[PDB]
Design a protein around this ligand. Structure first.
Ligand SMILES: CCCCCCCCCCCCCCCCCC(=O)OC[C@H](CO[C@@H]1O[C@H](CO[C@H]2O[C@H](CO)[C@H](O)[C@H](O)[C@H]2O)[C@H](O)[C@H](O)[C@H]1O)OC(=O)CCCCCCCCCCCCCCCCC
Ligand code: CLA
Ligand code: CLA
Ligand code: CLA
Ligand code: CLA
Ligand code: CLA
Ligand code: CLA
Ligand code: CLA
Ligand SMILES: CCCCCCCCCCCCCCCCCC(=O)OC[C@H](CO[C@@H]1O[C@H](CO)[C@H](O)[C@H](O)[C@H]1O)OC(=O)CCCCCCCCCCCCCCCCC
Ligand SMILES: CC1=C(C/C=C(\C)CCC[C@H](C)CCC[C@H](C)CCCC(C)C)C(=O)c2ccccc2C1=O
Ligand code: SF4
Ligand SMILES: [Cu+2]
Lengths: 31, 42, 93, 99, 146, 154, 743, 73
């Protein structure tokens, strides 16, 4: 219920993980 | 002698002698009139 | 290739360029069928690229959110909060 | 009466800055944090007599090590203002009075 | 230089001690001792073997800015060829080892470009500069709040 | 006075600093023998300090709240001895040096190998040239008016 | 085959013709200067004899004569030392009361108010305190008056003149031929026996006759001027008999092999002398006697003229195994035809030897009243450390020079070198991995401790009170050393050094000379830091040497030479691919490593060794043992070491140490100035010089010798020179001011 | 709270939620009368917003919503 507790991991761990995975996939493959 | 004169006027040697003379002159001037912060004569 | 001292031939470029596998086994499965018949059947639903990626991402995210939003006081001192009165600044406070 | 040179937070101040002591007592200036700390007595705004070297440290000495004390017996009616030569510009100035 | 001058003048004025600046500004040792060394005690004491206080975050940043800046000196002094040869031998080593040659890079590793290396070195230099000075200024002014 | 400063002769912090300096010097003297070489050196230094402070008071320098002399360079005629006549002296000497060097460079510029006379200074010619710097203020002025100080066609 | 003396008469006639022509050695340089760059080149290749010519004989003759010149310079330096000690020093006052007076052997004339530097050093003297440790050497040698110092100075001056004349005579009148220089067996035999062994025997003979009786009288409390002169102890032998009875028999114990009777002055005590705080002189004399025997024996190994002996070629070629093919075959021909190979080997060995000398010299002080002279100890250690590091880096420089220039498999082929050049890639890759691993675990632990402390989690730190990293191996070794005397080495009474353990603290004049040094977690961390830095600098130097000739980037790097800027911006950029640039980077990393080593030594000594003893035996250390708990974080190093100990130097103004503060600031300036050269390129500077030169052309005052900007390699060299000077000088000023004010 | 006594209270920027903090860090960083570790603002926004007329948290919320709309536009 503590709003910071939910979001700090969400923006510091989940968001960078998904963003780095997606950008690595985009940058690193022939189109 | 002639070659001694020639080498004795080469850039490094001439510069060191000139700067030694200048240093001595400035040292003596400071010694006679030390702690001079202004020109009081006129 | 390998006749005596020759180390080059256009017929077999793979061998010429050293395209070998230094340690490939080329041997049959050391597992008996029964064990493999279990592993390949229970681990089957995790062998899809997109499905596995999406499931891993969202499941890990939800697990992290749940474990961080419901942490107990003995876990993280950050959320247990302060337990002392606050001091004053040199003149502010 | 013990007073510590420098605060725990690294502040360059005495602990207490102002010392009101009774005569027959000697101040020990123990080192705390921010050392090397030096205590030097003013020589000016100081009562009647009391020569400076008696209670000063050489203007070129510093107490070292976390726990080193400087012992001064004082014993002379009036007030004495002391300060730290290195940190005198940071507000490390104190004052001791004997009433 | 501009901000050093401003901050020293204002920190000595806020203490009612403008004299001190007047005496010690004329020579460089005054700047080094009475300003940098003198106003840097609470900051470096932000955390010590006897605990930490609210300034610790700055004391850490103060060191962080010292590190970035220093690693900036790397890209500015060492240049490309050395790193290129080192990366070549690294590529050989990775390609020659068991179990890891099963993993293959897809873009050939190369040393940073000359212009890119200059830019990265300058960026490190600037980030370290800014972070260390910001830590020092905020910790020293906030340490005294005056 | 100018800029809120006061003359050093009647200033008080200047005298206090003078006394403190002499006290510091004397503190060391009492340790040695009364008439040993170190004692004589320290006494000579003390006399030098006293003479310096007396001279500074004599010349009429301005002292600030710090008690130290301050130099006025706005151009006030009461202070031309602080920057303007030393400035004129420096300009004369520096123009002497530059004019002599330029004369040497121009003199040796006509040989087939001028660089030889540059790493090995032709002292005979230099000794004749150095004395032109006595009157360089006139030589340079007429050099400019005659229009050959500055290389035309460039 | 035989060893004999071969020379040539009047190879070069002394004259002044070449003095008038700058740069006679190079034809183009001899022609004259076209641009200012010429001038720099003239100096950059002054002593590069192997490039001015290709004849080995001429190079060898030039090397021999230059050696004579440098030996003359050293002798002049020593004569200056002894003269300054004789006239401008308070040596006798210090001799009367060592602990009381601070040694000083330099005064400054009073000219511009600099006489403030003539500080109060005690003994009715005012001068500049010296940290060279000459007073201790003179006391250990038995010098008591200034007449002896004057005589030594005059003799050293005469020997400097003799060295200079020898250099002139050997280069211009009688120049040895090549076969003479290539005779390495006899050279090794003479240097091992004629120089080292015989010299050690001579010094032992001096110590038995002069050092021992004189120092015994001095330690007995006799005033220095009342002691019999050193020669009397030779004329009348009862003088020696009184101090040590065993001199009564005189030599007969030595010839009947009753050597035990000489136990009086030839002992195996160990430890320190409790009165002077140095090694027992009766141990040093025995030391030099044994060393003399060992070297006089070892100098009889190689065959010269009488059949008996060893041929170095035979020894080398007799070694070879299945892993190295025919290794060691051909090395004799490599090491007798290339000077750079020998220079690199000797430079590496001398650098390592100097480092070991520093370690052993602060471990067990060998001179009286040296241990408690903290300034002398610190200065000597730091000086020797820096000298050794520089020599080691030069070793790599010259190995690379040899590799580029004199290595030739067509005529001089060696198998081991070939195999190394063939698996250099594996060597460098593994060394790179080791460097990364050490860097992460040594420095990463410091960063971890710093982060934990900043977050208020001291329980998670790598400290002696949280997570301990105890050097069990070092503790075990020093414990075995402490138990050594009486167990494994029965003949010794005290352990080799007091740093091993056993208690028995030794103090002199109220100051701690030495006591056991404890090893904890901070010591573990700093030692691993040392290993990391040494490995990284070795990586740089070894990579420079191995890849000097060719690589996968530039397959013809040897054709470009040992020294060159680059190979253009092709292949992505080939900046600093030459071996000289690898030495240039190795210099920075050597500076880093040595700075950390000296910082560790200084802080550890101040925290856990140096200090003042009191009546009850309570040792108060200069720093109250804060190294163990403060050195484990970078913030502690910045606060409890640099900030805390810089107070002494920064305050030095207004006193006799003001020169140290001036040099502190000036060294900072020069170091920051170096970055000007290290960060820029010569293109910008040449473009700016174009506008400057135009401004000069406008006034008919442009130089004939065109002013070019510095070459790329010269820019790098200037940058590294200024960087090293500034850093080393600021550390020098810091150390000297701190230890003179607090010591 | 700041507008009540501008001279004797430190303005707060935002709260800290760092799972790496230790207990003493949490104790040391709770200032300004907050219920947890917070950061003391030095951008000077408190004085600026006070001078222009903002007094309550509702005004700040309305400004934030208006600016979100503005960025969307
Ligand atoms: C108190 C109230 C009264 C005051 C009167 C003051 C008078 C000036 C001061 C002193 C006068 C006596 C000086 C000594 C007498 C000999 C001087 C001389 O004739 O010495 C001879 C030289 C020659 O002067 C000129 O010198 C010029 C340069 O020539 C040579 O200059 C060099 C001379 O050595 C070289 O030979 C060089 O190759 C060559 O260029 C000209 O070209 C001519 O040669 C020649 O006219 O005079 C020189 O300047 C020599 C250098 C010293 C000149 C000093 C001038 C004053 C400053
Ligand atoms: C650029 C402005 C900005 C900045 C610098 C921050 C910074 C911060 N916010 Mg925050 N936030 C913002 C706007 C901003 N916020 C807005 C407009 C809202 C909606 C009113 C929120 C709602 C919010 C909540 C509920 C929380 C934070 C929290 C935090 C802190 C922890 C990290 C975090 O949770 O990520 C931010 C979390 C979000 C949910 C942000 C979503 C809102 C914006 C629109 C996202 C922007 C994404 C966009 C693609 C990139 C912007 C451009 C550029 C900056 C990259 C951190 C100091 C946490 C905290 O309190 O710290 C302890 C917390 O729980 N924020
Ligand atoms: C005493 C008279 C004398 C004279 C007239 C000459 C004349 C000559 N020598 Mg010679 N030489 C002498 C003494 C002399 N030498 C001595 C005593 C030695 C023993 C060291 C040598 C060893 C020697 C060698 C090995 C060589 C010569 C060479 C030469 C010829 C080339 C130019 C030259 O001399 O170099 C330039 C003149 C200089 C003065 C250069 C400076 C050298 C000194 C030693 C520097 C001092 C070091 C200083 C302390 C460094 C610290 C710097 C600090 C002050 C800032 C020339 C004809 C060279 C040659 O013949 O080429 C084929 C050659 O290779 N000489
Ligand atoms: C722009 C830089 C600068 C300037 C303007 C000065 C200016 C001055 N310095 Mg100084 N100095 C400097 C840099 C500078 N210095 C640096 C970098 C150092 C460190 C090496 C020093 C170290 C230094 C010392 C140790 C001393 C000075 C002193 C002096 C004063 C002496 C004047 C004099 O010599 O009598 C007059 C000299 C002449 C009239 C000579 C010219 C006459 C010619 C030869 C004859 C012409 C005939 C027509 C003067 C005001 C001295 C002083 O007493 O300060 C008050 C002194 O003791 N300086
Ligand atoms: C007892 C025999 C002996 C001794 C004592 C020495 C001693 C020395 N040699 Mg030497 N050498 C010898 C035999 C000897 N050599 C033989 C037989 C050969 C031919 C294979 C060589 C070939 C040789 C070369 C090529 C070189 C040396 C060098 C050196 C010096 C090395 C630097 C040093 O440590 O300085 C120590 C300083 C001292 C000990 C000070 C005292 C010096 C005394 C006076 C030396 C006198 C010894 C000499 C051999 C006497 C013969 C000459 C006689 C006609 C007067 C050193 C002085 C190097 C050099 O030039 O020196 C810089 C060097 O390049 N030697
Ligand atoms: C006995 C030791 C020794 C000897 C005999 C040599 C001999 C030689 N070296 Mg070498 N070297 C050594 C040690 C030694 N080195 C060490 C320890 C290092 C590591 C630093 C190096 C690194 C090195 C490099 C990188 C190079 C050489 C090169 C050379 C050759 C030419 C050097 C030359 O004359 O250039 C000219 C010499 C100078 C211009 C003198 C430099 C002046 C220095 C930088 C100033 C010192 C400042 C002073 C200490 C303090 C300030 C004083 C000032 C303010 C007044 C020559 C055969 C060069 C070569 O090409 O090999 C063939 C070359 O590239 N050396
Ligand atoms: C502060 C300045 C600085 C730093 C940090 C470094 C660091 C390094 N240098 Mg170096 N160097 C510097 C200045 C510096 N240098 C300068 C000014 C020069 C010019 C002379 C050089 C010239 C130079 C050369 C020629 C070489 C190096 C090499 C190296 C590397 C050695 C490998 C190692 O240590 O492993 C590990 C790395 C470290 C211990 C550095 C710190 C790592 C931290 C503790 C890890 C933190 C991880 C953290 C969890 C990350 C999460 C953050 C996330 C948000 C991304 C290393 C990374 C050598 C090399 O590349 O090795 C083969 C090499 O050959 N340097
Ligand atoms: C394992 C490490 C070690 C080391 C470094 C030493 C070192 C030393 N021992 Mg020692 N020793 C050791 C183990 C060790 N010992 C053990 C395990 C024992 C049995 C418990 C002994 C018993 C022993 C005795 C009885 C003596 C020494 C002595 C000595 C000293 C003179 C060495 C000598 O005689 O020259 C070398 C002698 C040779 C014959 C050359 C052969 C070299 C070996 C055997 C290979 C020397 C400092 C002597 C002493 O008293 O010192 C003053 C002595 O009397 N040792
Ligand atoms: C007091 C400090 C100030 C001193 C001013 C000195 C006089 C300056 C004016 C005269 C300059 C001059 O004549 O040269 C002027 C110089 C060139 O000088 C000119 O050269 C010409 C070609 O040779 C002629 O010889 C002219 O006679 C000559 O004056 O050029 C300039 O400086 C441009 C200014 C306008 C002309
Ligand atoms: C270290 C170094 C290299 C080698 C540098 C390499 C190989 C970079 C390796 C860095 C890796 C990729 C990790 C870096 C982590 C970064 C913090 C990630 C930034 C990525 C985005 C967030 C921008 C050069 O190539 C070079 C070239 C010319 C002059 C100087 C140098 C130089 O100093
Ligand atoms: S920047 Fe300089 S060193 Fe690098 S490739 Fe260009 S010219 Fe060569
Ligand atoms: Cu203090």
């Amino acid at each position: 219920i503590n709003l910071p507790s939910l979001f700090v991991p969400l923006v510091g761990l989940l968001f960078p993980a998904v963003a780095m995975a997606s950008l690595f996939l985009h940058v690193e493959k022939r189109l | 002698m002639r070659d001694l004169k020639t080498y004795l006027s080469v850039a490094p040697v001439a510069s060191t002698l000139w700067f030694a003379a200048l240093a001595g002159l400035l040292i003596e001037i400071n010694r006679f009139f030390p702690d001079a912060l202004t020109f009081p004569f006129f | 290739y390998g006749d005596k001292s020759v180390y080059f031939d256009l017929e077999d470029l793979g061998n010429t360029t050293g395209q070998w596998d230094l340690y490939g086994s080329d041997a049959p499965s050391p597992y008996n069928s029964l064990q493999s018949k279990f592993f390949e059947t229970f681990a089957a639903p995790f062998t899809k690229r997109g499905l596995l990626l999406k499931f891993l991402i969202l499941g890990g995210g939800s697990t992290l959110a749940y474990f961080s939003a419901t942490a107990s006081g003995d876990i993280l001192p950050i959320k247990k909060g302060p337990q002392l009165p606050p001091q004053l600044g040199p003149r502010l406070g | 009466v013990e007073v510590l040179l420098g605060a725990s937070d690294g502040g360059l101040a005495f602990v207490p800055s102002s010392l009101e002591v009774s005569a027959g007592e000697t101040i020990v200036f123990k080192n705390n944090a921010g050392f090397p700390h030096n205590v030097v007595f003013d020589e000016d705004e100081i009562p009647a007599g009391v020569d400076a070297s008696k209670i000063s440290m050489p203007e070129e000495d510093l107490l070292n090590a976390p726990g080193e004390t400087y012992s001064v017996k004082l014993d002379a009616k009036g007030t004495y203002k002391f300060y730290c030569s290195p940190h005198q510009g940071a507000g490390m100035v104190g004052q001791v009075t004997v009433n | 230089w501009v901000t050093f001058y401003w901050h020293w003048k204002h920190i000595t004025l806020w203490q009612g001690n403008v004299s001190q600046f007047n005496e010690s500004s004329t020579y460089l040792m005054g700047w080094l001792r009475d300003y940098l060394w003198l106003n840097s005690s609470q900051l470096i004491n932000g955390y010590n073997p006897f605990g930490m206080n609210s300034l610790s975050v700055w004391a850490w940043m103060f060191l962080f800015g010292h590190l970035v800046w220093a690693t900036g000196f790397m890209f500015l002094i060492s240049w490309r060829g050395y790193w290129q040869e080192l990366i070549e031998t690294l590529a050989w080593a990775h390609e020659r080892t068991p179990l890891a040659n099963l993993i293959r890079w897809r873009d050939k590793p190369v040393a940073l470009s000359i212009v890119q290396a200059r830019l990265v070195g300058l960026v490190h230099f600037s980030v370290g500069y800014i972070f260390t000075y910001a830590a020092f200024l905020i910790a020293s002014t906030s340490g005294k709040f005056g | 006075d100018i800029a809120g400063l006061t003359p050093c002769k009647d200033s008080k912090q200047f005298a206090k600093r003078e006394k403190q300096s002499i006290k510091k010097l004397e503190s060391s003297l009492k340790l040695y023998a009364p008439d040993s070489a170190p004692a004589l050196a320290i006494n000579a230094t003390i006399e030098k300090t006293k003479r310096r402070f007396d001279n500074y008071g004599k010349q009429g320098l301005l002292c600030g709240a710090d008690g130290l002399p301050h130099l006025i360079v706005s151009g006030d005629q009461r202070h031309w001895g602080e920057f303007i006549t030393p400035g004129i002296l420096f300009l004369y000497i520096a123009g002497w040096i530059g004019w002599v060097g330029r004369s040497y460079l121009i003199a040796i510029r006509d040989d087939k190998k001028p660089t030889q006379k540059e790493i090995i200074i032709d002292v005979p010619l230099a000794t004749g040239l150095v004395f032109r710097g006595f009157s360089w203020p006139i030589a340079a002025y007429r050099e400019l008016l005659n229009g050959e100080l500055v290389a035309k066609d460039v | 085959p035989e060893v004999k003396i071969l020379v040539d008469r009047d190879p070069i006639k002394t004259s002044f013709e070449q003095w008038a022509k700058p740069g006679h050695f190079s034809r183009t340089i001899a022609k004259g200067p076209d641009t200012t760059t010429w001038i720099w080149n003239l100096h950059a290749d002054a002593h590069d004899f192997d490039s001015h010519t290709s004849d080995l004989e001429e190079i060898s003759r030039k090397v021999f004569s230059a050696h004579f010149g440098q030996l003359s310079i050293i002798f002049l330096w020593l004569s200056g030392m002894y003269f300054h000690g004789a006239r401008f020093s308070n040596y006798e006052a210090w001799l009367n009361d060592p602990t009381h007076i601070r040694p000083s052997a330099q005064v400054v004339w009073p000219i511009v108010g600099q006489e403030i530097l003539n500080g109060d050093v005690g003994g009715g003297f005012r001068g500049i305190q010296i940290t060279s440790g000459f007073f201790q050497i003179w006391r250990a040698s038995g010098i008591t008056s200034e007449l002896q110092l004057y005589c030594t100075a005059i003799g050293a001056l005469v020997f400097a003149a003799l060295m200079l004349f020898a250099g002139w005579f050997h280069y211009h009148k009688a120049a040895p031929k090549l076969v003479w220089f290539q005779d390495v067996e006899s050279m090794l035999n003479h240097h091992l026996a004629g120089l080292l062994g015989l010299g050690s025997l001579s010094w032992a003979g001096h110590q038995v006759h002069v050092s021992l009786p004189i120092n015994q009288f001095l330690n007995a409390g006799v005033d220095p001027k009342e002691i019999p002169l050193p020669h009397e102890f030779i004329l009348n032998r009862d003088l020696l008999a009184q101090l040590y009875p065993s001199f009564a028999e005189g030599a007969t114990p030595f010839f009947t092999l009753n050597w035990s009777k000489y136990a009086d002055f030839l002992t195996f005590r160990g430890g320190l002398d409790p009165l002077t705080g140095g090694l027992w002189l009766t141990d040093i004399a025995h030391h030099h006697l044994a060393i003399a025997i060992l070297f006089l024996i070892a100098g009889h190994m190689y065959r010269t003229n009488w059949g008996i002996g060893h041929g170095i070629k035979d020894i080398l070629e007799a070694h070879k195994g299945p892993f190295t093919g025919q290794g060691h075959k051909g090395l004799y021909e490599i090491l007798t035809t290339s000077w750079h190979a020998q220079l690199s080997i000797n430079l590496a060995m001398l650098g390592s030897l100097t480092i070991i000398v520093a370690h052993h010299m602060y471990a067990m002080p060998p001179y009286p009243y040296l241990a408690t002279d903290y300034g002398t100890q610190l200065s000597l250690f730091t000086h020797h450390m820096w000298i050794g590091g520089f020599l080691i880096v030069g070793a790599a420089a010259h190995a690379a020079i040899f590799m580029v220039r004199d290595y030739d498999p067509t005529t001089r082929y060696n198998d081991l070198l070939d195999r190394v050049l063939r698996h250099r890639d594996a060597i460098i890759s593994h060394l790179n991995w080791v460097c990364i691993f050490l860097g992460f675990h040594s420095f990463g632990l410091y960063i971890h401790n710093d982060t934990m402390s900043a977050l208020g989690r001291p329980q998670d730190m790598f400290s002696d009170t949280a997570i301990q990293l105890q050097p069990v191996f070092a503790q075990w070794i020093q414990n075995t050393h402490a138990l050594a005397p009486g167990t494994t080495a029965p003949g010794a009474t005290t352990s080799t050094s007091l740093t091993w353990g056993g208690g028995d603290l030794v103090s002199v004049g109220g100051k701690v000379a030495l006591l056991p040094i404890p090893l904890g977690t901070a010591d573990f961390l700093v030692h691993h830091i040392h290993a990391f830095t040494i490995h990284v600098t070795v990586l740089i130097l070894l990579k420079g040497v191995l890849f000097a000739r060719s690589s996968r980037l530039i397959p013809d790097k040897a054709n470009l030479g040992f020294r060159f800027p680059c190979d253009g911006p092709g292949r992505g950029g080939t900046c600093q691919v030459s071996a000289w640039d690898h030495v240039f980077l190795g210099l920075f990393w050597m500076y880093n490593a040595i700075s950390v080593v000296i910082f560790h030594f200084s802080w550890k000594m101040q925290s856990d060794v140096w200090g003042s003893i009191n009546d009850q035996g309570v040792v108060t250390h200069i720093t109250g043992g804060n190294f163990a708990q403060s050195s484990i974080t970078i913030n502690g190093w910045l606060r409890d070491f640099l900030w805390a100990q810089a107070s002494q130097v920064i305050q030095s103004y207004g006193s006799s140490l003001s020169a140290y503060g001036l040099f502190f600031l000036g060294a900072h300036f020069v170091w920051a100035f170096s970055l000007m050269f290290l960060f820029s390129g010569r293109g910008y500077w040449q473009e700016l010089i174009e506008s400057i030169v135009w401004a000069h052309n406008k006034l008919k005052v442009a130089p004939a010798t065109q002013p070019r900007a510095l070459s790329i390699v010269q820019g790098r060299a200037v940058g590294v020179t200024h960087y090293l000077l500034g850093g080393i000088a600021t550390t020098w000023a810091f150390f000297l001011a701190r230890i003179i004010a607090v010591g | 709270a700041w507008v009540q006594d501008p001279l004797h209270v430190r303005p707060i920027a935002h709260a800290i939620w760092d799972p790496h903090f230790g207990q003493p860090a949490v104790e040391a960083f709770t200032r300004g009368g907050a219920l947890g570790p917070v950061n003391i603002a030095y951008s000077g926004v408190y004085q600026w917003w006070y001078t222009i007329g903002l007094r309550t948290n509702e005004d700040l919320y309305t400004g934030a919503i208006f600016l979100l709309f503005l960025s969307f536009i």
